[PDB]
Amino acid sequence: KRKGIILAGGKQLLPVYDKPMIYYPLSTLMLAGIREILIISTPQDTPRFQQLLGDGSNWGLDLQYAVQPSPDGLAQAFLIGESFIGNDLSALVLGDNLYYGHDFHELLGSASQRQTGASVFAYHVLDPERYGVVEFDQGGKAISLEEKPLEPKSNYAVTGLYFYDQQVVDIARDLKPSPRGELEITDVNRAYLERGQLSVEIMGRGYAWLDTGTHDSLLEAGQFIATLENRQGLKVACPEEIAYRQKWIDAAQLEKLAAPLAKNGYGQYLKRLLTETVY
Amino acid sequence: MKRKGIILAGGSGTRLHPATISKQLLPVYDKPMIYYPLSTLMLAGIREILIISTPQDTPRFQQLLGDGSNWGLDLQYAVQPSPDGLAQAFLIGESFIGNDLSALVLGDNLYYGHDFHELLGSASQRQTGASVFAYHVLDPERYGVVEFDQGGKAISLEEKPLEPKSNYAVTGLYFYDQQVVDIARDLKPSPRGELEITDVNRAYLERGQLSVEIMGRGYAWLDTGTHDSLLEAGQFIATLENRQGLKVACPEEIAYRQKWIDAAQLEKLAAPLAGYGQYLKRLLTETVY
Amino acid sequence: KRKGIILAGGSGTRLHPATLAISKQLLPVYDKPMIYYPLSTLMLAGIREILIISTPQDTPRFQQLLGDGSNWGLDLQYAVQPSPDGLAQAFLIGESFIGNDLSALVLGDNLYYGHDFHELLGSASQRQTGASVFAYHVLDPERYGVVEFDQGGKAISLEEKPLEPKSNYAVTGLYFYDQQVVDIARDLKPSELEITDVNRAYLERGQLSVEIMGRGYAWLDTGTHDSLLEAGQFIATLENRQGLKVACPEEIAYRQKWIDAAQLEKLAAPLYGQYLKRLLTETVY
Amino acid sequence: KRKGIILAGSKQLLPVYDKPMIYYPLSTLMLAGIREILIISTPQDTPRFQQLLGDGSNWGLDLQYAVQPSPDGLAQAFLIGESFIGNDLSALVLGDNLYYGHDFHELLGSASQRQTGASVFAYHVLDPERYGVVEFDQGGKAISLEEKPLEPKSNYAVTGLYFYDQQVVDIARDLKPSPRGELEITDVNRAYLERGQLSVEIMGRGYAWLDTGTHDSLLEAGQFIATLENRQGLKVACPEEIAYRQKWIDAAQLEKLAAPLAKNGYGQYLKRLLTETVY
Ligand SMILES: CN(c1c(NCCCCN)n(Cc2ccc(Br)cc2)c(=O)[nH]c1=O)S(=O)(=O)c1ccccc1
Ligand SMILES: CN(c1c(NCCCCN)n(Cc2ccc(Br)cc2)c(=O)[nH]c1=O)S(=O)(=O)c1ccccc1
Ligand SMILES: CN(c1c(NCCCCN)n(Cc2ccc(Br)cc2)c(=O)[nH]c1=O)S(=O)(=O)c1ccccc1
Ligand SMILES: CN(c1c(NCCCCN)n(Cc2ccc(Br)cc2)c(=O)[nH]c1=O)S(=O)(=O)c1ccccc1
Ligand SMILES: [Br-]
Ligand SMILES: [Cl-]
Ligand SMILES: [Cl-]
Ligand SMILES: [Cl-]
Ligand SMILES: [Cl-]
Ligand SMILES: [Cl-]
Ligand SMILES: [Cl-]
Ligand SMILES: [Cl-]
Ligand SMILES: [Cl-]
Ligand SMILES: [Cl-]
Ligand SMILES: [Cl-]
Ligand SMILES: [Cl-]
Ligand SMILES: [Cl-]
Ligand SMILES: [Cl-]
Ligand SMILES: [Cl-]
């Protein structure tokens, strides 16, 4: 079994065009076939996520909630989430990451099916210095990770989507804090790399990986999603749809979810899914 | 005679669900939507403001804005139990208005342009009657619509007409004398079952006490009430601010330029925020004409 | 061998006055002419021999921009569509150009983006017989050729711009054909000489492959002021995020090995140019 | 009373949303009441402007064309345009410039009515180092101009709209190339400043002055104009409209222009001008 964690650090309640930002990472985990999900946020925001999503049983999900008292690093998700993870495999997604593209279901599926080691994704960006950066040898094997380097060794940033085996809790517990006293995800990923158990999969230029964490980037992500949805008459990262297509809820349950929203474009969309075949 | 302000940040029901943080708490680029109508009232020289919203949203506005004393304002809060029309602001706000002149602004309206201070100033200085603004739009049937005679005098108002008599919509910014509370009290619900601001404005028109000022095409009046319109407004503000290195509708700036807060107060506001905090600090050091 | 045709048809006065200055398919989508997108699409399919068909007025302007294409390892030719009497007319105008070869037709104002696009074109291109088209879920199918599917997902009807669409699956402006298409086009009667009638002829012989182009691909129309602006913002967002260009023909020629490092360096020097130089030094997976 | 020059150093043929870029500076000169306009461009581009605009008699204009053989600086417009200007006052519209705002007609009118000296506009920008920069004293009087300073003395850039008396040709003739080896408009403006004949008017933050000279800025200008026009049902910088409202063309001339465009939003708009009162 693989359990999911969304870290919504100290924003993920803001809309990207037509739905809350958190619908995107939630939909990402759901596409990977993960239905048991811990949402970690600030003391102030955790209750607001609870109020919005509840226990998730309406979407065939099992949602739980935990607080990050202070932003002491992303790897703190594994300590906060230790009892939630138990003895299971896990996946970690960041709250302000948006993914789009063809074969994304297959790309997540393959990473998810690995019973041992860790899987991350490398994506060519203009500004790699803002992220974890992967260095490759001539043969395309990952040989180094650097967190926000002044002099990036490549243009390949590690995305905010991480797949882990049962070692991650123990690796997180044994992490030496950074000079700033923070538990860094890059140190978790380097631990797997040093054991020869880090799979770095290329996320090709044919995929969109967008940040939604600045005023400018949120606006650009909004326009991007609006253009796709208005062209297609299909929604990106509609959790009700992904639950339906995963068979976690049936036609009758989707109809019940649509009814209260029926006066607006979202409820009308959910109803139309019942009457058309989408390939 | 003092003029008090009302922002009606009404419920949109389930219209913007599931995206809706309430509508007027959503950002237009870099600041909450409510900063725009708040900045509008402040530019008109209004410091005493009632914010009317849903029971669920009222606490979130209070948490964001507080009593407004940090910005030289006196902010109060009231609830609209149900969205039974915009003219209900004058009943909810009756004791707040008391014997004073008033201004009403809608929560999802954005204004921009040169002479906007002068345009508000002139409307605000009228001690009697009411002032509204007429703006040429593509879809007037969505608004209150003004009909003009050959001489350019307003002769009719219609709320959301099937057959608009012009392309001039009344904007969500209204200036009133002490008659508005009494006019609002006598209003009966419209065919749509609402207490309509257009009925308030028609009452002033019939007494020959409605000033309809043209808001020229050189001004931007933007609606932020749909997913699409909010996105367009965001890009519009982003383009202006990134070009100018100046912010549109930064309340701290307007308070400072009105001399409602001094350099020392602005510095105290800037420190905890130190792009927004950096912007507030630059206001202290730069001459902007 | 498979030869390519780009039909950059007249839009009449539809986009005037913006298109009084520059033809529709010469208008930029963010950072490059519209025609770079369909050209790059044919190049990604491995097609090097391409006929560009346009109006009498616009054909010379395409020639002035692109020349014979030898700079990009291409063989570009030009022909005129006297009047916009239908898309199937490309096969009559292009008859002697096509000769005895397989063909592909792309429309001038169609933009494609997505992962596996090289593989999707590759598979369609490798079919030596019949025709291949792509079906894409759209909001407004009534604007396009519309595919009807049976319960088993087999294509059973095509209708051009139906009042009552039988699905939300539009046929995209990208078509792969065997040696039958010229003969089918010759026998077509006006409805315009419609590409949907060509595709239905292949369907009736059981030789039409309708591949689903999934929602994970972007198929954008650039034929209105609004749609061109949206396409511009879409490409700008991808390119500024990635530090990579969409549909840069020099890059696709280089990665296809149609031009070498020395040829790319010669193209970069007079110039976009900084981007071409970076291609020489960086491994992009 | 005043002749116009558009220096188009091609960029100015590209559309800003729904019309060629050059419609914007042309509409600007027309709003100032200028009907006699010289378009200066490269040998290659001058014919393309001629093909688009012709002699301008359709819009009640008198359009002429001249070539800049080599890009030796924007002040060369006054040498190339010397015989065109003759003994008249002039206005120059330079760069890839878009203007919008309330009182713009009045702002141009006032600058235009000055019978002596020169008038320029100063606008607060984020990146003044890209432009001519105005320094002000404590009393707000202009005291220095610098072309693209490394250390700008203010955030006030001089816009690409210049009003000149009959001295400009003689000042241009006496100019020597700058360190960058160009005849610079800033040197023309400084000559007027030194003789106490430069009026620097503030263009307030309530006006939009947009650059359309990069891929990014052209896209942003497109979205800006699209937002205004689709909101208002009114067009920005439609030359036919400005000619009609200036009474340079009559209803019969406007009808002839509108009919061939009538199946699109532009011709429908020109027809609406015949029947509708817009204040
Ligand atoms: C745009 N995509 C997207 C979808 N396509 C995936 C195509 C299936 C493989 N042929 N499906 C269909 C879908 C089909 C089967 C199943 Br089981 C689940 C979902 C949706 O329901 N919602 C989507 O939003 S996505 O890029 O993969 C994605 C998804 C989620 C967040 C972010 C991005
Ligand atoms: C963009 N404008 C705008 C400003 N300009 C006003 C023009 C100067 C008068 N000559 N000032 C300066 C300003 C100067 C003096 C005083 Br007292 C108050 C404010 C700001 O501080 N913030 C602004 O945001 S605005 O269109 O009028 C507007 C304003 C508010 C909401 C919406 C729209
Ligand atoms: C965005 N893509 C895109 C690319 N990706 C394709 C990735 C295949 C990797 N296995 N390549 C790389 C590329 C790699 C190998 C070869 Br041989 C040719 C080109 C480019 O050079 N330019 C591109 O622009 S695209 O969607 O396929 C496309 C392409 C053309 C027009 C429109 C859209
Ligand atoms: C948006 N404006 C704009 C207009 N407003 C001016 C309002 C004056 C009210 N007293 N008029 C009306 C107009 C009215 C009377 C006469 Br005579 C000429 C033109 C237009 O016809 N076209 C416009 O496009 S503008 O900012 O000045 C401008 C103008 C040009 C380029 C860029 C920007
Ligand atoms: Br990492
Ligand atoms: Cl986050
Ligand atoms: Cl790819
Ligand atoms: Cl289905
Ligand atoms: Cl009204
Ligand atoms: Cl105006
Ligand atoms: Cl045509
Ligand atoms: Cl086309
Ligand atoms: Cl569509
Ligand atoms: Cl078809
Ligand atoms: Cl897909
Ligand atoms: Cl200057
Ligand atoms: Cl101003
Ligand atoms: Cl550029
Ligand atoms: Cl149009």
Peptide bond into C17 cis (omega under 30): yes
Q: Best mutation site among D34, D59, D103, D105 for ligand 4, i.e. most ligand atoms within 8 A of its Cβ?
A: D105
CA nearest neighbour of D24 among D251, D222, D271: D222
Q: Quick one: tokens of A51?
A: 């109020």
CB contact under 8 A, D17 and C232: no
Could you tell me if A3 and A33 are in contact, meaning their C-beta atoms sit under 8 angstroms apart? no
Flag if A276 and C168 touch (Cβ within 8 Å): yes
CA dist D183 and D75 (Å) reads: 5
Give the pairing type, strands C49-54 and C2-8: parallel
Question: DSSP secondary structure string, D141-186?
Answer: -EEEEEES-SS-S-SEEEPSEEEE-TTHHHHHHHPPPPTTSS--HH
Given a contact as 3+ CB pairs under 8 Å, which chains touch C? A, D
Give the three-state DSSP class for B195.
coil
| CA B168 to ligand 6 center in whole angstroms | 44
β-pairing verdict for C169-171 and C131-137: antiparallel
Of B118, B128, B214, B121, nearest in space to B176 by CA:
B128
CA C251 – CA C260 distance, rounded (Å): 11
Residues D172, D57 contacting (CB under 8 angstroms): no
Spell out the residues 6+ positions from residue A244 whose beta carbon is closer than 8 angstroms to its own: A250, A251, A253, A254, A273
Closest to A187 measured CA to CA, from A177, A197, A199 = A177
* Pairing state between β D89-94 and D161-164: antiparallel
Assess B15–D contact: CB distance below 8 Å, yes or no. Answer: no
- Which of D257, D28, D250, D3 shows the shortest CA–CA distance to D160? D28
* Residue A243 to residue A245: CA distance in whole angstroms: 6
Task: Nearest chain A residue to B19 by CA: give it.
Answer: A19
CA distances from A36 to A21, A65, B98 (A): 19, 11, 56
Say which residues have a Cβ less than 8 Å from residue A257's Cβ, sequence separation at least 6: A58, A59, A240, A249, A270
Helical packing angle, C261-268 and C273-281, nearest 10°: 160
- How many Cβ atoms from other residues are within 10 Å of residue B283's Cβ? 19
- What is the SS3 assignment for D133? strand
What string of H, E and C letters represents the secondary structure of A258-275? HHHHCCCHHHHHHHHHHH
Phi then psi for residue A87, to 5 deg, are -105, 15
CA–CA separation, C235 and C29 (whole Å): 7
Ligand 4 atom with minimal separation from the D31 CA: 18
- Which run of H or of E encompasses A20? strand A19-20
Angle at the Cα of C150 from the Cα atoms of C158 and C212, rounded to 5 degrees: 65
Ligand 2 binding residues, C-beta < 6 A: B 39-40, 43, 111-113, 116-117, 248-249, 253-254, 257-258; D 204-206
Residue D265 counted as an annotated binding residue: no
β-bridge mates for residue C98, sequence order: none
* β-strand partners of A249: none
Contact C261/A178 with Cβ under 8 angstroms? no
β-sheet bridge partners, residue C110: C221
Record: contact C215-A234, CB cut-off 8 A: yes
d(CA B7, CA B21): 18
CA closest to B241 among chain D residues: D126
Q: Which DSSP string do the residues of A174-188 spell out, in sequence order?
A: HPPPPTTS---HHHH
Question: Any CB–CB contact under 8 A between C218 and chain A?
Answer: yes
Strands of chain C, DSSP E: 2-8, 49-54, 75-80, 102-107, 110-113, 131-137, 145-149, 155-160, 169-171, 174-177, 208-212, 218-221
Q: Where are the domains of chain A?
A: 1-279
Residue A101 Cβ < 6 Å to ligand 1: yes
Q: Which helix (H) or strand (E) holds A35?
A: none
8 Å CB contact of C115 and A102: yes
d(CA D258, CA D268): 7
Task: Using CB atoms within 10 Å of the CB of residue D209, give its burial: 0 to 12 exposed, 13 to 18 middle, 19+ buried.
Answer: buried
Q: How many CA atoms lie within 13 A of D31 on its CB side?
A: 23
D9 vs A254, C36, D53, D154, CA distance in Å?
60, 25, 17, 27
Cα A232 to Cα D224: distance, rounded to the nearest angstrom:
25
Report the distance separating Cα A214 and Cα C226, nearest Å.
Answer: 26
Give the separation between CA C222 and CA C228, rounded to whole angstroms.
4
HSE of B254, CA atoms in CB hemisphere, 13 A? 21
Conformational region of residue D24, where left means phi above 0, alpha means psi within -120 to 50, and beta covers everything else: alpha
Residues 191-210 of D with CB under 8 A from B: 202, 204-210
- Residue C82 CB: number of other CB atoms within 10 A? 10
Find the radius of gyration of the CA atoms of chain D: 19
Please name the residues in contact with B265: beta carbons below 8 A apart, sequence gap of 6 or more: B70, B72
Pocket of ligand 1 contains residue A99 by CB under 6 Å: yes
Cα A49 off chain centre by: 16
**Cβ pair B132, B174 in contact under 8 A:** yes
Taken in order D5, D9, D13, D15, the sign of the CA dihedral is negative
Q: How was this structure determined?
A: X-ray
First-to-last C-alpha distance (Å) of chain B: 30
DSSP B122-146: HHHH--SSEEEEEEE-S-GGGSEEE
Partner residue facing D278 (CB), from B136, B138, B220: B136
Instruction: Residue A96: name the closest of A5, A42, A21 by CA.
Output: A21
Q: Can you tell me which residue has the tokens 């009045």?
A: D106
Q: How does strand C174-177 pair with strand C75-80? A: unpaired
Structure-block tokens of residue A185: 């995800």
In the Cβ-directed half-sphere of A82, how many Cα atoms lie within 13 Å? 9
CA distance linking residue C67 with residue C74, whole number of Å: 10
What is the separation of C-alpha B256 from the centre of its chain, rounded to a whole number of angstroms? 20
> Are A60 and A35 in contact, with CB atoms under 8 Å apart?
yes
Query: Residue C154 burial by CB count (10 A; 0-12/13-18/19+): exposed, middle or buried?
Result: exposed
Binding-site members of B for alpha-D-glucose 1-phosphate are 109, 144, 159-160, 170
Does D52 contact C at CB distance below 8 Å?
A: yes
Residue D201: strand, helix, or coil: strand
Which residues, 6+ apart, have CB-to-CB distance to B228 below 8 Å?
Answer: A226
* Pair B4, B97: CB distance under 8 Å: yes
Which ligand places an atom closest to the C-alpha of B130?
A: 9
* d(CA A82, ligand 1 centre) in Å: 29
CA distance C96 to chain A (A): 36
Helix (H) or strand (E) holding A89: strand A89-94
